[PDB]
Amino acid sequence: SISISYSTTYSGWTVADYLADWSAYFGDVNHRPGQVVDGSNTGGFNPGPFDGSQYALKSTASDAAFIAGGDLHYTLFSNPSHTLWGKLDSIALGDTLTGGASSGGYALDSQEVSFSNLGLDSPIAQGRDGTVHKVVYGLMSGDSSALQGQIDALLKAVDPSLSINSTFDQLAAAGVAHATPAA
């Protein structure tokens, strides 16, 4: 089942609350045609350059950041172009990236919430319509709807009473979430 870790700072928050709020701070890095010309809004893979167990990206509006974990692959200019696909196990959200390929891996200085054991696997054949692509490109572009939908489906798979409109606390009571110390 999905496993969620959250700082007790967000006790009382719903998952949807938090994601909407995080997305508001992160904004949109404008990773769009004609608007990616350097490393300021690409993010990066570990080990990379185009494949990794992690992909990480910091906001260009704030120091909000996320890390996607799993077995991940970006097609860049090969077909289907600009598609992230593969296995997505985790999404970790917070503030300020640290580390990298040459540091033992990426991490967040403040990791606020993470979602793991997502069990998502999108084949390259699905192109940008794959769930993995939609989830991560959504986050990059200021739209966490895809992530929210997937989390909601995973929670309801555990029990139909669970939701992204559940508080983190309720999800902990249900055995899916685990509180970590204040942020």
* Residues placed in the known binding site for heme: 31, 74
Using alpha carbons, list the distances in angstroms from residue 97 to 36, 106, 112.
Answer: 20, 7, 12
List 8, 27, 90, 137, residue binding ligand MH0 (CB under 6 A) = 137
List 30, 42, 116, 126, residue binding ligand MH0 (CB under 6 A) = 42
Q: Is residue 40 within the footprint of ligand MH0 (CB under 6 A)?
A: no
Could you give the maximum distance between any two Cα atoms of the chain, in Å? Answer: 47
Q: Is residue 92 within the footprint of ligand MH0 (CB under 6 A)?
A: no
List 6, 18, 66, 74, residue binding ligand MH0 (CB under 6 A) = 74
Convert 112-135 to b/e letters by CB count within 10 Å (16 or more is b). Answer: bbbbeebebebebeebeebbbbbb
Distance, in Å, from the CA atom of 111 to the CA atom of 146, rounded to the nearest integer, reads 21
List 133, 135, 151, 167, residue binding ligand MH0 (CB under 6 A) = 133
List 19, 97, 136, 155, residue binding ligand MH0 (CB under 6 A) = 136
Q: Is residue 124 within the footprint of ligand MH0 (CB under 6 A)?
A: no
Residue 73 DSSP symbol: E
Q: Is residue 178 within the footprint of ligand MH0 (CB under 6 A)?
A: no
- Residue identified by tokens 């593969």 is 86
Q: Is residue 82 within the footprint of ligand MH0 (CB under 6 A)?
A: yes
- Count, in order, helices (H) and strands (E) of the chain: 4, 8
Q: Is residue 75 within the footprint of ligand MH0 (CB under 6 A)?
A: no
Report the binding-site residues for heme b: 31, 34, 74, 82, 128, 137
Span interacting with ligand MH0, options 109-117, 130-138, 159-167, 175-183, rule CB under 6 A: 130-138
Provide the strand spans (E) within 10-135: 44-47, 51-58, 64-74, 84-100, 105-116, 120-122
Number of Cβ within 10 Å of residue 145's Cβ equals: 13
Q: Which residues bind ligand MH0 (CB under 6 A)?
A: 31-34, 36, 42-43, 49, 55, 74, 76, 82, 84, 128, 133, 136-137
